[PDB]
Amino acid sequence: NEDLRLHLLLNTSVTCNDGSPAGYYLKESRGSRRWLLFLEGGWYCFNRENCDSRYDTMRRLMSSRDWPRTRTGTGILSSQPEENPYWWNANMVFIPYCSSDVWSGASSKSEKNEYAFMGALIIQEVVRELLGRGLSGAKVLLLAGSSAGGTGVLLNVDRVAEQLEKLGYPAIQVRGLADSGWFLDNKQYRHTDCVDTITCAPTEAIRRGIRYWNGVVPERCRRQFQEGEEWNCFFGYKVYPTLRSPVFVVQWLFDEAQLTVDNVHLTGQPVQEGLRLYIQNLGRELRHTLKDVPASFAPACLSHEIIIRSHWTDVQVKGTSLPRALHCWDRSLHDSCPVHLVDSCPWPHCNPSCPT
Ligand SMILES: O=S(=O)(O)OC[C@H]1O[C@@](COS(=O)(=O)O)(O[C@H]2O[C@H](COS(=O)(=O)O)[C@@H](OS(=O)(=O)O)[C@H](OS(=O)(=O)O)[C@H]2OS(=O)(=O)O)[C@@H](OS(=O)(=O)O)[C@@H]1OS(=O)(=O)O
């Protein structure tokens, strides 16, 4: 009705982890030449035993077999102007995450591999099918994503731009919006042994992950690191300087997933001093990485994801909402209103508009 409708890919050799077809949800808005393609997140798995666990626990993130027919767009995917002040009338696309690979996998599997990891190919296939359903008429394609989909934007936004240029669609301005996908490859609070997905230190997870997935990173970033050191390009502050497409970075300064991989678990128990200082330092490192990111929005809150959350309009930095900052960034790209909005206060909830 006003919901997005599911389409499984016509090419059924591009699959989710378990061999079922990948897909996308679409809501067309034929009065608009703006396209929002959203990449879903939800961790990853970097070896067979952890991928077998995720397949029993979270099969939705590995298979299309039970995806619903439609879904309602929320936050920046909402078609309601009250919920989505600047992009409500856009063509809306939600790409479910079923590849467990941070949108990096680019091969068909072997019969000898259990799982297929195809996220980068999924994105390319979605883009091609959208051409026949109106993307051919587009002037802007914003590739947005949360969490692993946020890092997936960083890995894929230039490939999507180069794909469309190569296909003969030079009018389409390709831009990225990376939400909660800007992580530090820092040391853990207390070092674990990488036996579970969530608790494996971030460097090691990606080091293992890129090999297990045969993941691909952007060439301009890859060229800056030694062979075998491609895992570097999964980290925002490393891949970002190489990106040609404009990219806006939304990142909580004390992101829950970042604390989780750093082996910190805040249950509402009293926060002791050692931990207190680790958390403070994390916020400061994260703010440092955003110093030369002119288009960014980074509140001092302990949270995770934002852009498809209904209450995304509630948070402010220096009296500027995120939708308003994204509108300023668009305005700034139209010519060829702050956009750098990073909290400087030192602890979760020092910003009074933080979600609860
Ligand atoms: O309903 S929409 O999704 O289409 O949003 C329309 C607004 O987008 C602008 C761009 O402004 S900005 O992103 O805030 O910087 O213009 C874009 O769309 C219009 C046509 O839409 S409209 O509803 O008839 O106004 C295009 O104008 S035109 O080509 O018909 O002349 C713009 O194309 S162009 O690059 O100027 O040629 C198009 O810009 S863009 O491709 O998105 O970068 C606003 O218009 S603007 O004033 O020219 O900058 C529209 O403003 S509105 O408040 O939603 O009406």
Ligand SMILES: *[C@@H]1O[C@H](CO)[C@@H](O)[C@H](O)[C@H]1NC(C)=O
């Ligand atoms: C389908 O995708 C597979 C896997 O990427 C690719 O090898 C093949 O060429 C594609 N076939 C068609 C007909 O699009």
Ligand SMILES: [Cl-]
């Ligand atoms: Cl159809």
